[PDB]
């Protein structure tokens, strides 16, 4: 499209030239001929292979707080006292609690129970152990208890502190709350969880800490201090952080052979892990399972006499089935889930007349919420006959526990669940399974910066373990919604995350923990990542100045490594602190770790939701506005909060988690030397002119880069690549069917590129051309009249202004490096550097680009 004109005032034009002359930067001269455009865009230490240090549990050391015990009963108490005190407390609890006895009886029926003696024997004599058994035997909930009680009953409760790693956030919290119940406790006594931005630490001795691997790695700066056993759960799922930890722990096992690693896996080939850990023993666990009659899409269409509404493996069909079964299946698009058939399959399950729950496997939040409303709109699937419980990570823990509840007699329990119900948790009374045969994976391509949340085909392993969910109670049934032809064009195993995930967050961990070369360390992985991913990670971190030319951790990189956030968002927060808008930026950063706090239900945003935006045309401004209004409503107590959150249609749980995350991000910046006065909550207006919010949007543009786009007409936008895309339906910038939005700038930075039959941009914020050139661009080529931004945008703007705004970028990044050496210096900055920040504040203003949002 034709270049967008930028109306820079003459006063601003000269101010930019002044500060560049004061900063001792030259204006790169124009090109001799417009044909050749000039580009305006402008330690000696090494590490060796070291091991993470280890030490066993002490009496006076708290492993969770990583501190000494000076005051309290266990201050200077002996290991022998503690051992008896905890034993006597447990032995008294068991005989005085008839409710705990009933629970302790349920435990001793679990298939894993009859292997207890063997597991304890293996772990006691061998460093590393693999506990292999079918999903639902009780590996996760019982093994850590067997190990703890074995030390308690034998008067060694002081010599036991267990770490249990889980792949998912909800697994670590659920299991903590479940094992707590199984000991008649709440989390905080002998059982605790530690996840990103949430923790209930357990007691200092005879304790189990359930956690995500990410948390554990961030706490290993000091080393594995005061831990006897490290249990790595659900290794078969091949979480990238789990794979990485197994590299770290194998080095720990070798240097400190007294430590006790315990790997626990579903029914897969564990030779790869066995060989990796020096041919360690494999304890086989198993209970009674029933043969499950497995059906494919052909069987499902024939048994139900189904007819769909008005390469592809549906066009291929077995010749042993009926003619109409062939013709019906043909009309089903395999890149959809057959919603109407699942509804018809539920009806068939009734006709069989054998009471049991139906576990439906769907990919992601989107298709489960679609399946739910689809059913409930049919009165037949009401409370009278049916109980439809959704099961994904983003549900409240109130509703996640309701899947385990028995239902009233003559009612069917249908679980619309994700891959969480595959191997992580087992549901009881499951006789029926409907497998969509799909997975939702986070595929990232760094060349165009596309976050592809794609629905892809599951493996034979997945189908085999999804089938196994039906055969725990009685002879079950599994309904695969994939052709017999498709089952052949399916892989044996899924691509492990290590092969298809960005490694820059693992690369910082490697350097922070001082484990040597990024490539050197990652070469020791059980299945090393692709070369191009390691090169990309090293390049990305060198660009941010997180690493130097020798690939060693800079003072900036050290901060980014300690922040549990995308390194680029980490740098955005550091810059926020220099501009004294740290709190706002910490809020924005935190918000990216949780779902949108707005309850939309799929439909476009109403008045209430859009009113938070103001005149800024920003989902990010809307989010900050919600937090300013919600934080005020909190002062009226817990009930006033619930009334505000329900009146405005906000997820109160999401706002609380985000705020707690913001406080923890703020905490790490303080500990890094940043002053508190640059992180104080500041009042702002989302309609009136506000210079603090102008800067916040500028630093936002830096953060989400290279997610920039240009608006065409209606919902159509063109991306960084120069390809057409759509404004997401959930955005405040998304118009209604008719009324076209007159945007005062066609430019937008945004959060992520959700791919669904097209390119859609979610979490959109309006930016001015000055912000584009300053923070939201790398390559800028000028021909004297027209500048070319990243070879996809042309601006009819002054050559001197473009070179000067590009000057400020380099000046700003130069200041960040100087600030990260001693963050205290942001309070007392050089007069020239304060004048450079004031000039960034100036071009941040809408007025500086000839725009008035009020009009
Ligand atoms: C609340 C508080 C007050 C003071 C200090 N710290 C915390 C805290 C918040 S979260 C947390 C944690 O996650 N600690 C933690 C987890 C894991 Cl998984 C292991 C180990 N111990 S170690 C390194 O492995 O020896 C330790 C501690
Ligand atoms: N929150 C819970 N509510 C009810 N039962 C549960 C809960 N968590 C686990 N269980 C039960 O514990 C048993 C084993 O669970 P788990 O330890 O996760 O097994 P594994 O890790 O071997 O697959 C199952 O019968 C399951 O139903
Ligand atoms: Mg398990």
XYZ file of C-alpha atoms in Angstrom, residues 154-844:
691
model
C 11.658 -46.424 61.521
C 12.509 -43.266 63.619
C 14.304 -41.270 60.820
C 11.665 -38.526 60.084
C 14.473 -35.860 60.377
C 16.481 -37.629 57.559
C 13.635 -37.277 54.931
C 12.670 -34.274 52.704
C 11.151 -35.183 49.257
C 10.834 -33.025 46.060
C 8.101 -34.227 43.589
C 8.206 -32.616 40.070
C 4.975 -32.466 37.951
C 4.794 -31.321 34.270
C 1.583 -29.175 34.640
C 0.747 -26.411 37.225
C -2.670 -28.002 38.117
C -1.027 -31.468 38.726
C 1.422 -30.042 41.373
C -1.460 -28.237 43.243
C -4.125 -31.038 42.872
C -1.698 -33.824 44.035
C -0.550 -31.611 46.997
C -4.246 -31.092 48.041
C -5.025 -34.841 47.402
C -2.002 -36.271 49.374
C -2.843 -33.679 52.136
C -6.439 -35.112 52.389
C -4.945 -38.697 52.447
C -3.057 -37.589 55.658
C -6.155 -35.755 57.094
C -4.269 -32.398 56.711
C -4.454 -29.212 54.584
C -1.367 -28.162 52.542
C 1.155 -26.615 55.029
C 1.949 -29.747 57.158
C 4.210 -32.516 55.641
C 2.656 -31.607 52.190
C 3.058 -28.375 50.132
C 3.012 -27.054 46.519
C 5.332 -24.469 44.824
C 4.277 -23.277 41.292
C 4.873 -20.024 39.303
C 3.464 -17.114 41.446
C 1.837 -19.396 44.136
C 3.159 -21.550 47.060
C 2.022 -23.145 50.367
C 5.414 -24.302 51.815
C 5.319 -27.476 53.981
C 6.976 -27.885 57.456
C 10.826 -28.043 57.656
C 11.120 -31.865 58.335
C 9.481 -35.150 57.120
C 7.942 -33.102 54.242
C 6.893 -33.565 50.543
C 7.134 -30.463 48.236
C 5.078 -30.910 45.000
C 6.273 -28.373 42.328
C 6.641 -27.575 38.582
C 10.236 -28.145 37.242
C 10.527 -24.385 36.398
C 10.180 -23.419 40.121
C 12.794 -26.082 41.167
C 15.386 -24.864 38.543
C 14.964 -21.178 39.696
C 15.581 -22.337 43.360
C 18.769 -24.369 42.397
C 21.001 -21.173 42.366
C 22.073 -22.230 45.936
C 21.797 -25.983 45.046
C 19.691 -29.006 46.226
C 20.174 -28.287 50.000
C 18.418 -30.511 52.619
C 16.671 -33.037 50.249
C 16.960 -36.897 50.520
C 14.696 -37.973 47.557
C 13.912 -36.234 44.182
C 10.816 -37.875 42.528
C 10.407 -36.933 38.791
C 6.757 -37.823 37.909
C 5.124 -38.423 34.447
C 8.520 -38.588 32.560
C 6.715 -40.372 29.618
C 4.927 -37.029 28.748
C 8.406 -35.625 27.741
C 7.878 -32.045 29.090
C 10.963 -30.020 27.898
C 11.784 -28.785 31.486
C 11.545 -32.458 32.725
C 13.993 -33.651 29.949
C 16.354 -30.737 30.948
C 16.191 -31.605 34.721
C 17.074 -35.303 33.947
C 20.376 -33.934 32.413
C 21.060 -31.901 35.643
C 20.116 -34.802 38.023
C 22.267 -37.438 36.168
C 25.301 -35.116 36.852
C 24.093 -34.822 40.540
C 23.682 -38.684 40.801
C 27.306 -39.185 39.531
C 29.027 -36.605 41.861
C 26.777 -37.361 44.929
C 25.669 -41.049 44.735
C 23.889 -40.925 48.193
C 21.009 -38.765 46.717
C 17.915 -40.817 45.654
C 16.297 -40.041 42.232
C 12.921 -41.811 41.520
C 11.571 -41.688 37.910
C 7.850 -42.667 37.540
C 6.403 -43.484 34.056
C 3.193 -44.813 32.389
C 3.263 -48.102 30.332
C 5.916 -47.071 27.691
C 9.419 -48.334 26.670
C 11.716 -46.939 29.466
C 14.995 -48.454 28.040
C 15.989 -44.908 26.816
C 15.740 -43.596 30.462
C 17.183 -46.875 31.942
C 20.348 -46.717 29.703
C 20.634 -42.904 30.314
C 20.774 -43.501 34.147
C 23.415 -46.343 34.022
C 20.961 -49.326 33.640
C 18.888 -48.628 36.837
C 16.270 -51.148 38.136
C 12.675 -50.937 36.685
C 9.943 -51.796 39.302
C 6.893 -53.127 37.318
C 3.467 -52.082 38.817
C 0.046 -53.425 37.602
C -3.558 -54.130 38.758
C -6.681 -55.747 37.176
C -7.661 -54.172 33.786
C -10.520 -55.338 31.457
C -10.369 -55.797 27.639
C -11.925 -52.664 25.962
C -13.876 -53.186 22.659
C -12.238 -50.442 20.474
C -14.328 -48.793 17.645
C -13.276 -46.426 14.765
C -15.275 -43.671 12.913
C -16.802 -46.352 10.542
C -18.228 -48.346 13.542
C -19.466 -45.080 15.237
C -21.445 -43.981 12.074
C -22.946 -47.520 11.522
C -23.950 -48.302 15.192
C -25.741 -44.868 15.385
C -27.113 -44.816 11.746
C -25.622 -41.249 11.664
C -25.887 -38.771 8.707
C -23.743 -35.561 8.803
C -25.187 -32.119 7.833
C -24.846 -30.706 4.259
C -4.859 -36.875 2.016
C -8.470 -37.074 3.450
C -8.688 -40.621 5.013
C -12.560 -40.420 5.256
C -12.760 -40.933 1.414
C -11.045 -44.327 2.206
C -13.371 -46.893 3.952
C -13.274 -50.693 4.651
C -15.307 -52.759 2.102
C -16.758 -54.946 4.974
C -19.092 -52.053 6.135
C -22.469 -50.873 4.692
C -22.798 -48.595 1.591
C -24.331 -45.592 3.520
C -21.571 -45.858 6.247
C -19.086 -45.124 3.361
C -21.202 -42.236 1.865
C -21.868 -40.627 5.335
C -18.195 -40.633 6.561
C -17.079 -39.007 3.216
C -18.905 -35.702 4.097
C -16.994 -35.288 7.461
C -13.997 -32.838 7.340
C -11.167 -34.559 9.365
C -9.874 -31.032 10.359
C -13.076 -30.764 12.527
C -14.361 -32.779 15.564
C -17.679 -34.608 14.828
C -19.802 -32.831 17.556
C -23.220 -34.202 16.351
C -21.835 -37.828 16.310
C -20.591 -37.554 19.979
C -24.189 -36.415 20.884
C -25.496 -39.521 18.960
C -22.784 -41.804 20.550
C -23.938 -40.674 24.076
C -27.521 -41.813 23.119
C -26.171 -45.266 21.956
C -24.295 -45.675 25.339
C -27.751 -45.435 27.102
C -29.243 -48.278 24.917
C -26.432 -50.673 26.117
C -27.869 -50.124 29.683
C -24.703 -50.660 31.851
C -24.196 -47.688 34.262
C -20.813 -45.877 33.820
C -19.246 -42.411 33.171
C -18.368 -41.239 29.583
C -14.858 -39.621 29.325
C -14.710 -37.509 26.070
C -11.150 -36.480 24.923
C -11.155 -33.069 23.088
C -8.254 -30.647 22.328
C -8.238 -27.340 24.298
C -10.664 -24.955 26.134
C -12.401 -23.957 22.831
C -13.895 -27.333 21.628
C -14.941 -28.430 25.212
C -16.986 -25.182 25.790
C -18.439 -25.667 22.221
C -19.447 -29.323 23.019
C -21.008 -28.262 26.407
C -23.457 -25.558 25.069
C -24.228 -27.837 22.022
C -25.514 -30.587 24.430
C -27.283 -28.363 27.066
C -29.293 -26.619 24.229
C -30.908 -30.113 23.792
C -33.220 -30.517 26.861
C -32.567 -34.355 26.855
C -28.995 -33.613 28.199
C -30.357 -31.756 31.303
C -29.718 -32.298 35.079
C -32.516 -34.994 35.073
C -30.514 -37.532 32.922
C -26.977 -36.010 32.452
C -24.162 -34.298 34.476
C -21.643 -32.645 32.025
C -18.387 -31.572 33.834
C -15.613 -29.764 31.861
C -11.970 -30.746 32.787
C -9.025 -28.515 31.623
C -6.176 -26.569 33.394
C -8.009 -23.154 33.460
C -11.065 -24.436 35.512
C -11.350 -23.510 39.229
C -10.278 -26.321 41.667
C -13.908 -26.224 43.030
C -15.160 -27.741 39.690
C -12.064 -29.947 38.905
C -12.775 -32.154 42.014
C -16.473 -32.677 40.945
C -15.332 -35.242 38.247
C -14.293 -37.656 41.109
C -17.710 -37.254 42.907
C -20.220 -40.124 42.458
C -23.501 -38.967 40.726
C -27.149 -39.738 41.706
C -28.461 -43.173 40.454
C -30.027 -43.152 36.920
C -27.752 -40.205 35.822
C -24.729 -40.423 33.398
C -21.498 -38.448 34.233
C -19.920 -37.091 30.956
C -16.331 -35.691 31.390
C -15.410 -33.282 28.508
C -11.614 -33.371 29.211
C -8.180 -32.583 27.615
C -5.045 -34.874 27.562
C -4.912 -34.225 31.401
C -7.209 -37.323 31.817
C -4.825 -39.476 29.639
C -1.997 -40.231 32.186
C -1.939 -37.349 34.809
C -5.224 -38.211 36.691
C -7.568 -41.296 36.710
C -11.401 -40.834 37.038
C -13.480 -43.613 38.748
C -16.617 -45.304 37.226
C -15.242 -44.687 33.639
C -16.626 -47.525 31.385
C -16.957 -45.411 28.147
C -14.397 -43.218 26.239
C -15.015 -41.072 23.073
C -11.529 -40.204 21.628
C -11.473 -37.307 19.054
C -7.875 -38.576 18.275
C -6.497 -34.951 18.379
C -3.811 -33.018 20.393
C -3.417 -29.204 20.903
C 0.347 -28.279 20.764
C 2.175 -24.885 21.033
C 4.132 -24.831 17.689
C 6.348 -21.673 17.367
C 8.106 -20.535 14.111
C 10.694 -17.777 14.904
C 11.243 -16.671 11.219
C 7.737 -14.999 11.016
C 6.926 -15.150 14.825
C 3.680 -17.251 14.503
C 2.268 -18.870 17.729
C 0.448 -21.822 16.010
C -2.067 -23.357 18.521
C -2.720 -26.162 15.951
C -5.047 -29.216 16.315
C -2.741 -32.143 15.247
C -3.184 -35.986 15.184
C -2.401 -38.085 18.326
C -0.062 -41.171 18.227
C -0.896 -44.932 18.570
C 0.518 -44.555 22.168
C -2.113 -41.800 22.880
C -5.022 -43.888 21.398
C -3.793 -46.974 23.408
C -3.675 -45.035 26.768
C -6.941 -43.077 26.019
C -8.554 -46.544 25.367
C -7.089 -47.870 28.695
C -9.188 -45.257 30.649
C -12.378 -47.334 29.891
C -10.986 -50.644 31.339
C -10.456 -49.897 35.097
C -13.990 -50.794 36.477
C -15.484 -53.355 33.968
C -15.132 -54.431 30.277
C -15.237 -50.942 28.649
C -15.714 -49.338 25.172
C -13.525 -46.746 23.301
C -14.979 -44.715 20.343
C -12.055 -43.367 18.195
C -13.420 -40.593 15.851
C -10.747 -41.370 13.149
C -10.932 -43.673 10.031
C -9.245 -47.153 9.868
C -7.176 -45.592 6.991
C -6.125 -42.658 9.298
C -4.971 -45.040 12.143
C -2.245 -46.243 9.652
C -1.068 -42.650 8.734
C -0.497 -41.959 12.524
C 3.025 -41.915 14.135
C 3.980 -44.392 16.955
C 5.167 -41.588 19.361
C 4.538 -37.774 19.532
C 7.446 -35.321 18.818
C 9.073 -34.589 22.239
C 8.882 -30.862 23.295
C 12.762 -30.620 23.190
C 12.490 -30.978 19.326
C 9.819 -28.216 18.808
C 10.159 -25.571 21.641
C 12.244 -22.348 21.953
C 15.333 -22.997 24.184
C 16.271 -19.386 25.229
C 14.534 -19.814 28.677
C 16.501 -23.133 29.157
C 19.687 -21.394 27.782
C 19.506 -18.690 30.559
C 18.932 -21.435 33.229
C 22.106 -23.278 31.947
C 24.162 -20.018 32.399
C 22.560 -18.951 35.761
C 23.215 -22.492 37.209
C 26.801 -22.300 35.739
C 26.578 -25.658 33.829
C 28.876 -24.527 30.935
C 28.101 -24.179 27.189
C 24.420 -23.956 26.026
C 25.212 -26.354 23.102
C 27.743 -28.401 25.180
C 25.126 -29.031 27.960
C 22.102 -29.595 25.605
C 24.244 -32.212 23.692
C 24.058 -34.403 26.891
C 20.180 -34.378 26.745
C 18.529 -37.882 26.541
C 17.299 -36.697 23.063
C 19.262 -33.505 22.176
C 17.331 -30.590 20.574
C 17.737 -29.494 16.909
C 20.946 -27.486 16.114
C 18.874 -24.591 14.579
C 16.901 -24.167 17.899
C 20.192 -23.833 19.941
C 21.598 -21.285 17.368
C 18.232 -19.357 17.478
C 18.242 -19.331 21.348
C 21.897 -18.042 21.453
C 21.114 -15.375 18.749
C 17.858 -14.184 20.502
C 19.719 -13.774 23.885
C 22.744 -11.975 22.248
C 20.251 -9.532 20.540
C 18.710 -8.669 23.996
C 22.273 -8.215 25.495
C 21.443 -11.156 27.872
C 24.660 -12.845 26.531
C 27.904 -11.208 25.186
C 29.913 -12.266 22.037
C 31.527 -15.125 24.121
C 27.966 -16.348 25.125
C 28.481 -15.494 28.871
C 25.697 -14.160 31.193
C 25.638 -10.284 31.349
C 24.302 -8.380 34.425
C 21.073 -7.875 32.329
C 20.894 -11.635 31.452
C 21.296 -12.478 35.199
C 18.079 -10.439 35.949
C 16.167 -11.994 32.946
C 17.263 -15.509 34.170
C 15.785 -14.815 37.689
C 12.446 -13.381 36.326
C 9.968 -16.264 35.685
C 8.810 -14.566 32.403
C 9.793 -14.409 28.660
C 13.263 -12.717 28.623
C 11.946 -9.962 26.234
C 9.117 -9.100 28.749
C 11.873 -9.192 31.450
C 13.821 -6.433 29.580
C 10.510 -4.461 29.129
C 10.109 -4.462 32.990
C 13.757 -3.218 33.537
C 13.035 -0.342 31.052
C 9.698 0.306 32.886
C 11.710 0.768 36.149
C 14.005 3.401 34.442
C 10.833 5.329 33.270
C 9.150 4.916 36.758
C 6.161 2.900 35.335
C 7.463 -0.494 36.641
C 4.167 -1.429 38.420
C 2.039 -0.915 35.233
C 4.575 -2.973 33.143
C 4.789 -5.740 35.857
C 0.913 -5.883 35.720
C 1.060 -6.253 31.862
C 3.866 -8.910 32.083
C 1.969 -10.872 34.824
C -1.286 -10.725 32.724
C 0.440 -12.681 29.841
C 0.904 -15.707 32.239
C -2.913 -16.109 32.836
C -6.067 -16.142 30.630
C -7.886 -12.803 29.913
C -9.818 -11.731 33.073
C -12.879 -10.800 30.865
C -15.736 -13.414 30.781
C -16.898 -12.981 27.107
C -18.327 -16.543 26.426
C -17.229 -16.327 22.713
C -19.558 -13.372 21.779
C -18.101 -9.833 21.097
C -17.326 -7.499 24.089
C -20.336 -5.552 25.528
C -20.400 -1.867 26.696
C -18.936 -2.619 30.213
C -15.840 -4.458 28.750
C -15.160 -1.859 25.953
C -15.556 1.097 28.431
C -12.333 -0.047 30.267
C -10.389 0.613 26.981
C -11.187 4.374 26.993
C -10.088 6.231 23.788
C -6.658 4.418 23.611
C -7.870 1.528 21.320
C -5.900 -0.983 23.505
C -6.749 -4.409 25.085
C -3.650 -3.755 27.319
C -5.031 -0.333 28.530
C -8.423 -2.100 29.123
C -6.551 -4.708 31.286
C -4.686 -2.022 33.373
C -8.030 -0.097 33.774
C -9.742 -3.319 35.098
C -6.869 -3.721 37.671
C -7.173 -0.015 38.780
C -11.006 -0.422 39.231
C -10.679 -3.940 40.836
C -7.935 -2.760 43.300
C -10.299 0.092 44.445
C -13.286 -2.357 44.822
C -11.042 -4.605 47.069
C -10.994 -1.862 49.816
C -14.721 -2.632 50.554
C -13.827 -6.238 51.597
C -14.107 -9.733 49.993
C -17.897 -9.487 49.222
C -17.677 -6.006 47.525
C -14.946 -7.607 45.277
C -17.245 -10.572 44.263
C -20.130 -8.083 43.504
C -17.779 -5.863 41.368
C -16.323 -8.935 39.523
C -19.866 -10.370 38.836
C -21.463 -6.962 37.886
C -18.555 -6.173 35.434
C -18.328 -9.911 34.348
C -14.675 -10.499 35.511
C -12.951 -13.774 36.643
C -12.035 -12.771 40.269
C -9.596 -15.778 40.558
C -7.617 -14.533 37.455
C -7.260 -10.932 38.841
C -5.998 -12.261 42.257
C -3.423 -14.681 40.669
C -2.153 -11.878 38.307
C -1.815 -9.349 41.225
C 0.119 -11.949 43.350
C 2.350 -12.626 40.250
C 2.949 -8.814 39.872
C 4.028 -8.605 43.600
C 6.527 -11.517 43.037
C 7.930 -9.893 39.810
C 8.186 -6.563 41.761
C 9.938 -8.552 44.594
C 12.755 -9.926 42.285
C 13.452 -6.407 40.795
C 13.795 -4.993 44.405
C 16.259 -7.844 45.334
C 18.258 -6.996 42.109
C 18.862 -3.404 43.414
C 15.962 -1.422 41.791
C 14.474 1.238 44.152
C 10.833 0.875 45.413
C 9.781 4.409 44.207
C 10.034 3.224 40.509
C 7.559 0.336 41.308
C 4.769 2.268 43.200
C 1.156 1.953 41.868
C 0.315 5.216 39.968
C -3.230 6.571 39.245
C -3.906 7.124 35.475
C -6.791 8.093 33.100
C -7.660 5.960 29.986
C -9.441 9.007 28.356
C -7.572 12.147 29.611
C -3.989 12.849 28.382
C -1.520 10.780 30.548
C 2.288 10.776 29.833
C 2.903 7.689 32.094
C 0.420 5.573 30.008
C 2.009 6.985 26.757
C 5.407 5.513 27.917
C 3.731 2.197 29.050
C 2.329 1.717 25.459
C 5.836 2.526 24.013
C 7.515 -0.107 26.313
C 4.609 -2.505 25.420
C 5.499 -2.044 21.677
C 9.117 -3.126 22.559
C 7.815 -6.160 24.547
C 5.490 -7.801 21.947
C 7.860 -7.063 18.951
C 8.017 -8.321 16.286
C 4.153 -8.572 16.505
C 3.368 -5.341 14.522
C 0.527 -4.992 11.901
C -1.193 -2.401 9.586
C -5.038 -1.973 9.385
C -6.730 -2.264 5.912
C -10.596 -1.995 6.187
C -13.067 -3.473 8.787
C -11.294 -6.488 10.487
C -8.567 -7.018 7.781
C -4.924 -6.253 8.854
C -1.542 -7.098 7.165
C 1.281 -8.618 9.327
C 5.126 -8.178 9.617
C 5.598 -10.696 6.698
C 3.303 -8.527 4.463
C 0.470 -11.163 4.536
C -3.288 -10.484 5.205
C -4.732 -11.221 8.721
C -7.872 -10.567 10.898
C -8.469 -8.591 14.170
C -9.564 -11.213 16.817
C -13.319 -11.152 17.805
C -12.360 -10.801 21.551
C -10.406 -7.479 21.005
C -11.824 -3.976 21.884
C -10.493 -2.758 18.450
C -12.709 -5.433 16.725
C -15.731 -3.625 15.169
C -19.423 -4.757 14.991
C -20.835 -6.147 11.653
C -21.724 -2.602 10.338
C -20.013 0.390 12.131
C -16.388 0.922 10.875
C -13.884 2.187 13.543
C -11.987 5.396 12.531
C -8.552 4.590 14.119
C -6.330 7.706 14.592
C -3.377 5.412 13.547
C -3.564 2.237 11.369
C -0.583 0.674 13.298
C -0.989 -1.971 16.083
C 1.363 -4.085 18.283
C -0.293 -7.264 19.761
C 0.276 -10.246 22.129
C 0.119 -13.456 19.973
C -0.775 -14.738 16.422
C -3.515 -17.414 17.034
C -3.793 -19.460 13.745
C -7.358 -20.813 12.988
C -8.004 -21.216 9.173
C -6.256 -17.755 8.946
C -3.876 -15.348 10.832
C -5.657 -13.534 13.762
C -3.979 -10.935 16.097
C -5.138 -11.060 19.797
C -4.364 -8.492 22.566
C -4.102 -5.404 20.270
C -2.792 -1.882 21.216
C -2.780 1.216 18.898
C 0.726 2.804 18.425
C 1.886 6.013 16.594
C 4.533 5.956 13.783
C 7.158 7.377 16.273
C 6.628 4.338 18.615
C 6.913 2.029 15.514
C 10.387 3.467 14.574
C 11.555 3.809 18.248
C 10.839 0.368 19.876
C 8.670 -1.748 17.431
C 11.203 -2.120 14.509
C 14.846 -3.285 13.911
C 15.803 -2.542 10.234
C 15.144 1.061 8.927
C 16.416 1.942 5.370
C 15.887 5.583 4.123
C 16.050 6.952 0.504
C 15.887 10.610 1.773
C 12.065 11.010 1.327
C 10.602 7.535 2.259
C 11.919 5.111 4.994
C 11.354 1.277 4.811
C 10.576 -0.359 8.241
C 11.574 -4.114 8.353
C 10.940 -4.359 4.524
C 7.071 -4.288 4.938
C 6.132 -0.640 5.970
C 6.848 2.678 4.121
C 6.533 6.073 5.968
C 6.558 9.528 4.241
C 8.574 11.033 7.180
C 11.700 13.293 7.572
C 15.124 11.512 7.162
C 16.604 13.392 10.213
C 13.643 12.437 12.520
C 13.824 8.716 11.454
C 17.645 8.612 12.078
C 17.122 10.514 15.418
C 14.218 8.297 16.744
C 16.525 5.367 15.709
C 19.294 7.235 17.645
C 17.162 7.230 20.868
C 16.684 3.396 20.508
C 20.521 2.895 20.688
C 20.851 5.539 23.494
C 18.012 3.785 25.448
C 19.587 0.266 25.016
C 23.032 1.756 25.972
C 21.392 3.131 29.208
C 19.767 -0.302 30.037
C 23.278 -1.970 29.974
C 24.674 0.806 32.299
C 21.553 0.506 34.592
C 21.786 -3.356 34.871
C 25.431 -3.017 36.161
C 24.041 -1.003 39.178
C 20.205 -0.581 39.076
C 20.307 1.911 42.054
C 21.555 4.637 39.574
C 18.038 5.115 37.958
C 17.145 7.512 40.880
C 20.239 9.735 40.139
C 20.671 9.703 36.287
C 23.028 11.917 34.152
C 21.418 15.224 32.970
C 21.884 14.158 29.259
C 20.325 10.686 30.047
C 17.291 12.291 31.858
C 16.921 14.589 28.757
C 17.067 11.445 26.488
C 14.247 9.792 28.581
C 12.215 13.093 28.447
C 12.544 13.000 24.592
C 11.268 9.325 24.522
C 8.392 10.558 26.807
C 7.749 13.337 24.178
C 7.569 11.067 21.026
C 5.492 8.587 23.178
